Amino acid sequence: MVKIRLARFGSKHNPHYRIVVTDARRKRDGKYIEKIGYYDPRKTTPDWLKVDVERARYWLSVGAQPTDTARRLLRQAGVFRQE
Amino acid sequence: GEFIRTKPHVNVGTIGHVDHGKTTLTAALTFVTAAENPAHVEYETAKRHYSHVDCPGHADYIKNMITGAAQMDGAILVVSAADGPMPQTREHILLARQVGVPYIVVFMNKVDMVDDPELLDLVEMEVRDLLNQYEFPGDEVPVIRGSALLALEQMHRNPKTRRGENEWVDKIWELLDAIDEYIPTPVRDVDKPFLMPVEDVFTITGRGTVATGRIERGKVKVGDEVEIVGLAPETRKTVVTGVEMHRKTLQEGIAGDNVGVLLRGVSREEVERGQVLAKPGSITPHTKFEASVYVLKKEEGGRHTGFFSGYRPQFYFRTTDVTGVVQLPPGVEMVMPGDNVTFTVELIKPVALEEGLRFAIREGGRTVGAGVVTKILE
Amino acid sequence: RNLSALKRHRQSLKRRLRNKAKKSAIKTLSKKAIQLAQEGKAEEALKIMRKAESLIDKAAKGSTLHKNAAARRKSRLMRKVRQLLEAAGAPLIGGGLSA
Amino acid sequence: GRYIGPVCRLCRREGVKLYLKGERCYSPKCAMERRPYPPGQHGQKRARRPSDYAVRLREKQKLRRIYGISERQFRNLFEEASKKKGVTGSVFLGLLESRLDNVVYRLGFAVSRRQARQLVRHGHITVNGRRVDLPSYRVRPGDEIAVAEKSRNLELIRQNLEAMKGRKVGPWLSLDVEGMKGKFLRLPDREDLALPVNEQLVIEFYSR
RNA sequence: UGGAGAGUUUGAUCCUGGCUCAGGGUGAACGCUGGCGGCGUGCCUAAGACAUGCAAGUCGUGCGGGCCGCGGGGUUUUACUCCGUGGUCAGCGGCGGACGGGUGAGUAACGCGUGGGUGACCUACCCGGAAGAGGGGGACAACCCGGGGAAACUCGGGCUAAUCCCCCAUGUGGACCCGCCCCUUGGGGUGUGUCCAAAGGGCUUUGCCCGCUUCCGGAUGGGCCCGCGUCCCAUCAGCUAGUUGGUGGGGUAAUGGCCCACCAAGGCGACGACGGGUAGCCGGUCUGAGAGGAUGGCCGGCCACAGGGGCACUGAGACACGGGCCCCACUCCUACGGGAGGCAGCAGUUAGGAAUCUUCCGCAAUGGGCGCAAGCCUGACGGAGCGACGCCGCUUGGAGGAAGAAGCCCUUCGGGGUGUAAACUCCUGAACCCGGGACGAAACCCCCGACGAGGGGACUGACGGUACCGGGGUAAUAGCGCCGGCCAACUCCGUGCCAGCAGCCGCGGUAAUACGGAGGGCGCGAGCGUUACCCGGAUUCACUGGGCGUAAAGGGCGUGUAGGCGGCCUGGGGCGUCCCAUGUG
RNA sequence: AGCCUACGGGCAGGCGCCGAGGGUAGGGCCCGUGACUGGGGCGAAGUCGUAACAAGGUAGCUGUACCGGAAGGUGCGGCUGGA
RNA sequence: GCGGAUUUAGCUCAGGAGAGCGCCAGACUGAAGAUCUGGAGUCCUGUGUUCGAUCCACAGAAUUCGCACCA
Ligand SMILES: C/C=C\C=C\[C@@H]1O[C@](O)([C@H](CC)C(=O)NC/C=C/C=C(\C)[C@@H](OC)[C@@H](C)[C@@H]2O[C@H](/C=C/C=C/C=C(\C)C(=O)c3c(O)ccn(C)c3=O)[C@H](O)[C@@H]2O)[C@H](O)[C@H](O)C1(C)C
Ligand SMILES: Nc1nc2c(ncn2[C@@H]2O[C@H](COP(=O)(O)OP(=O)(O)O)[C@@H](O)[C@H]2O)c(=O)[nH]1
Ligand SMILES: N[C@H](C=O)Cc1ccccc1
User: Fold this and answer.
1) Which of B132, B152, B288, D100 is an S-S bond match for B28, by CB 3.0 to 4.6 Å?
2) How far apart are CA C8 and CA B321, in angstroms?
3) What is the CATH number of the domain that holds D201?
């Protein structure tokens, strides 16, 4: 089905993923259905994680199991916290 | 299939007149030993592991006998009891001497054809004298009497035939024992820089090119960088992708081992017989050098006329022969047979050379000189 | 050499042989029906035509007929029956079809 | 790179005396002061009117040789400069002056650009704390360019800043001779620079 | 924010006109040369042929066994070997094997591109909502028994478990025929009649978790259709029988000659039909001042194919590269009785060619399949290796040092040049040496709360003892092309229309700045040249932006069809045209 | 005629249409090659004559036609780029 | 690697080292040409056989064609 996962970018020895939603079937770095954030697993920038929630919120409201580690970041950006 | 080094390795082979039994004996040797331990073959005794080259021995294979004999630690001279020594017996003995085969073990074959004790003793006497004639210790060499054919046929009947069960097969064990005892295991120069003269080059279908030869010194293993020196326009450098002993994966080849070295990215058009594989920078290609040379006497099979400037004989270095132009010192018009002199040479093709390297000089199929490189000029 | 996926084939076969059957029944069973409408029968036709239906919707459960194929077979089957009994007979016998 | 080889051999040819050695290129012997003519068997012979091309050329080769920088590197700047909005003519220089090796020269730490390089390369220089050895490196406005602690005691870097006590320097700079650490005020404007060159020709030349 | 021109027809001139050079670019190759590193990149030729290893599986929380290794008594004991659990090999059954990876052969087509249509349609796993799961029955592997074979593997016989197949029930609902109302291509509702449902397994067990079934909605992924756009030859001009349409069928998820009967004769074409040739399309890429010209290699998207051709089955989805059937070619194996294979997956071999790599490390990260999870697989991927193929960074030193060694080259014999160059003196210190040493990795999992929201704990690194930091520390590679003009850089000797050079113009016939060597110089520099190809300059196919009296160019003249173009004034429409907004890109 | 049944029916097997390819036949389009033959291009100093440029020493040229070793000659007609 | 074929003036080519050609030079030219004058190997290498070797023998080399197998 449709998923919320990361897509590698940047250069070698310098990951820089892209929080995105695509159909499982498309390849990793394939064509996404819609972007929702970026993540730098090295924090070279003070802004390494980032996630448009409204969007990430929607894509879930419609069903879209995100990678385990896609959940992580999402969560971490306070996607589920409801108070 | 892997090859595990467990016994000292020795290189031997069969020489002797045509039809006397060299090839039949070679086959018998492999079958007989196969019963115990489960033209280039291998076989082992309780004492050593042997690589054996069976020389066709014909005149048109002369250059091949030269390189084959040069890599032998000892040779098995096969002489038919029904014929006695013949022209090739004498020819192979001289060649063995000139290329330095260190020891000779004799196998009087076809005794199944001769029973008369006197004729058998006469043949042995003749062979011993023949060996003495070329300066081999004829009176000390082992002379085993047997039948390669009957031994071979017995093994064909019963591949499991073991020592002590068949008189003919036991004669082969007598030879194997003589080889184990009379031919000493030489000291291998395993601590020196790797160097292996290329004997032949083949393409292992679906694997790449492979260069075979006997390691002269040093060692070699997969992942080792090696230079291909001589003959070609420039020295080529590659990496070893494989090392095999009789087509079996070998951990590391060492001096004395006759192996197959598979090379990376090199076609059979980039490696050839005569070139040498060596540790990068250990040896270089040259064409001009000075050398101390002994001109063989007519009484030693050489010519009665001497060397002269402009003479272009063949120079034999390790596994190949290249034409070289001789240049004598000023004033010297000729170097006569029996004399030792130093002159310059310019090969028509580059060859991996180094000071102290020995080489022979031949004009066609006749040995006319023995030299040693004394100085590399270029 | 071989890599155990043959089972799929194995299964394939079975599964085929499987529906091949039921599918034919639908047919033979269907024809049987129309044959009675063409022969201008009445109940027996419907009874058949009726049984027909059931056998079909049943085939729809498995990986045999599905989607509209389901209906398609019926939307036609009983579509003809009526248009064969309108040749006097009249659905005197309450079967699948309704006045 | 950085040329390497005869220099007061260009202190010639170009004619226009340019300082490549520094100290000596002040002596009564920049050789230009001794030989006012281009090197070679000829050099001193009636010279033909240089073609409208030779000019546009010789000027370029001049300026470039001044900073001792490869055509490749040179060229790349020029383009970049031709690209950046504004008066390409000027710009060029700016980027050409922003080279660390250069700065470290104007800031006195080095008796000549060639020497500058070495220093920058050997890590004897640093920036905003961390050290650098990228001669090419383009310094931004507001950067502190000083000697490294380990270097602070180099017999040379000493003798150099020594003379610096007194002399003023580039209006777009600020040398703190004491703690031997200059700053990068801003990109110099043409008026600020004053080399024996007509940037126009260079521009022209690159449209050949 | 952008546009430069020169050489060559003449005794000289202007014009025309072709040729040619200066620039940029390339998946390059070839020559001479070659020190360090990062990031990129690498069969353009035979869609020729391939050794070997590895590339797709996974569930014991669906079922029953074989083999192996633990724990425990029903009759009074071994036997019918009944039970809970942890290995292994298959079987059954489920989900995946239709993605991912590879290639450009074919395709001039609704293939691609772009913008719409679907009242003509499908969509497994994931979401949201509504509703339920009561009873029996059935047979096939495994397995056991006997048999054939070298192998691949197969026939006969006897048992058996299910989330396997089947029937009856229940039917919120949903499917189908006819009629009614609403709407309008078959869309929504409704009346009678008929038809269709389910599967258990696991834990903390009248309480949940994972599943099952049915229906509606969503989301994602498609099918089909249409308008416009997308190559050279007209020395290819007429083409067409399922051909064009029709009524009725068949077929499908669905439209439709897609297919079949029967009927009607149509349908297309100089706005280029039909035919030949050539070709995967786009995003983009290269050049140009732009308009254009050329191009489609890497990466992304669409299509197509898996030795050549055809066909179905299974399934949500395939006519399915590592599934099946048949024909053909080819290669192989063999016990000569039959069988086997399909690198355009990774790497590697051979052939061809001017030419294009390691049979590498790892699943640690990302992504994917199965599973509740632990976790298994992953040549996808993440890294490493090989080649100046490209881009970028960097080194072979720095400051001094003679009115100026030597050597070598010129020399009007005084001297001039190489040249501050060197030597020499000081300082720096690539390499090398020792010490320390990563980011990438926080989740899944464990405890509290509710297995959620929120908080706390723990494991995991291929690259790698590499980067990078600190200490010590030696002056430590340079080459190639050119120097008559265009085009920057000149003298001597040799040679004597010879030898040779050469992009166009041209040079060499005994004083050559053009050949060959030398001294010197100019250019670029770990590169420099050469050959090939694209754009430019070329306003030299000219819309921007050209022409035809003599330079190439008016049809021998006329009549006229299509087509192109069209006086003045008033009013209606508003297709071109123009503006705004919005979708898209 | 066989196999299964829960009697409806299914499978096996039989027949037919479609059908890859294979065969035979007769066409179309393109490429290669072929005794000999036709012209054409280019190549320092070979032969024959003199057509053209000055009335080019018969103005020239040109369509056509015949003719001659060769350029070319001539007939009719045309043009001036001849008088 | 195994075998065959091939290797004589500058160019073409055949047991007492030749033919043809043109080729080289001189004269002449301001030159080239044209004319006149004139001139002219190691036979792939070495060694051997022979009174004498391009020729015969052996060794070798190179070119070329076919064969070659496959750690
Ligand atoms: C021999 C061929 C190639 C050799 C190559 C190189 O040789 C070497 O360089 C080698 C090193 C010495 C070498 O150069 N050999 C090169 C040479 C080396 C020569 C030595 C040693 C010698 O001493 C003078 C000894 C044999 C010495 O001679 C005597 C021989 C007498 C023979 C008389 C034969 C005569 C009348 C005769 O008519 C005759 C015959 O009867 C039979 C066969 N035929 C054909 C004959 O004609 C005796 O036997 C002594 O022992 C090395 O071995 C290298 O590694 C190698 C093998 C690469
Ligand atoms: N009688 C007999 N014949 C033998 C013997 N050894 C070999 N042969 C034969 O002699 C011939 C030559 O043998 P081979 O080994 O080929 O000889 P090579 O030329 O030395 O290799 C063959 O026919 C063999 O069978 C033996 O011991 N006795
Ligand atoms: N070990 C090598 C391969 O078998 C020895 C060899 C070389 C060459 C030929 C045969 C054997």
Assistant:
1) B152
2) 65
3) 1.10.1050.10
C-alpha distances (whole Å) from B244 to each of B110, B257, B259, B261, D197 are 36, 10, 6, 7, 70
Q: What does the alpha-carbon distance between residue B301 and residue B290 come to, in Å, rounded to a whole number?
A: 24
* Distance of alpha carbon B33 from the chain centroid: 23
Ligand nearest to the CA of B113: 2
List Cβ neighbours of B59 (8 Å cut-off, separation of 6 or more): B365
Inter-helix orientation angle B148-157/B22-34, to 10° = 40
Alpha-carbon span B105 to B79, nearest angstrom: 11
Contact D169, D108 (CB under 8 A): yes
Concerning whether B321 is annotated as a catalytic residue, the answer is no
For D76, the enclosing helix (H) or strand (E) is: helix D71-83
Exactly one of B7, B23, B63, B192 is catalytic; name it. Answer: B23
**What ranges in chain B are assigned the alpha helix state H?**
22-34, 62-70, 87-98, 117-133, 148-157, 167-182
Q: Within a 13 Å sphere around the CA of B155, how many CA atoms are in the beta-carbon half?
A: 26
3-state helix, strand, coil in chain B (%, to 5): 25, 35, 40
What are the residues with a C-beta under 7 Å from any atom of nucleic chain G?
A: B 60-64, 202-205, 207, 210, 212, 241-248, 259-262, 273, 303, 305, 308, 310-314, 321, 323, 348-349, 362-366
CATH number of the domain enclosing C29? 1.20.58.110
Please check whether residues D14 and D80 belong to one and the same domain: yes
For residues D64 and D134, membership in a common domain is answered with no
Q: Rounded to whole angstroms, what are the CA distances from B259 to B198, B219, B241, B280, C3?
A: 10, 11, 13, 19, 38
Q: How many helices (H) and strands (E) does chain D have?
A: 7, 4
Residue partners of D196: CB distance under 8 A and separation at least 6? D16, D17, D18, D62
Q: Experimental method for this entry?
A: cryo-EM
Strand E nucleotides within a 7 Å radius of protein CB atoms: 1, 3-4, 22-23, 38-40, 50-52, 56-57, 90-94, 96-97, 99-101, 121-128, 152-153, 165-168, 174-178, 191-198, 214, 218-221, 250-254, 299-302, 313-318, 320, 322-324, 340-341, 343, 348-351, 357-359, 365-369, 380-384, 386, 392-404, 409-410, 416-421, 426-430, 439-444, 452-454, 463, 470-471, 475, 486-491, 519-526
Query: Residue B19 catalytic?
Result: yes
Q: What backbone torsions phi and psi does residue B174 show, to the nearest 5 degrees?
A: -65, -40
Could you tell me the domains of chain A?
A: 1-83 (3.30.1320.10)
Lookup: tokens for B346? 């310019």
- Give the Å distances, CA to CA, from B345 to B99, B320, B352, B368: 21, 16, 14, 15
Instruction: Provide the positions of strand F that have an atom within 7 A of a protein CB.
Output: 8-11
* Resolution number, Å: 6.4
Task: Specify whether the backbone of D70 is left (phi greater than 0), alpha (psi in -120 to 50) or beta.
Answer: beta
Domain that holds residue D103: 97-193
Q: What is the C-alpha R_g of chain D?
A: 18
- Of the listed B7, B19, B63, B246, which one is catalytic? B19
Q: Is B325 in contact with B345 (CB distance < 8 Å)?
A: yes
What SS3 state is found at B329? coil
Provide the CATH number for the domain around residue D150: 3.10.290.10
| The total number of structural domains that make up chain C | 1
Q: How many separate helices (H) and strands (E) can be counted in chain B? A: 6, 23
Nucleotide nearest to C26 (CA to C1'): F9
Structural domains of chain B in order of their starting residue, each with its CATH number:
1-186 (3.40.50.300), 189-280 (2.40.30.10), 284-377 (2.40.30.10)
Nucleotides of G under 7 A from a protein CB: 1-3, 42, 45-48, 58-62, 69-71
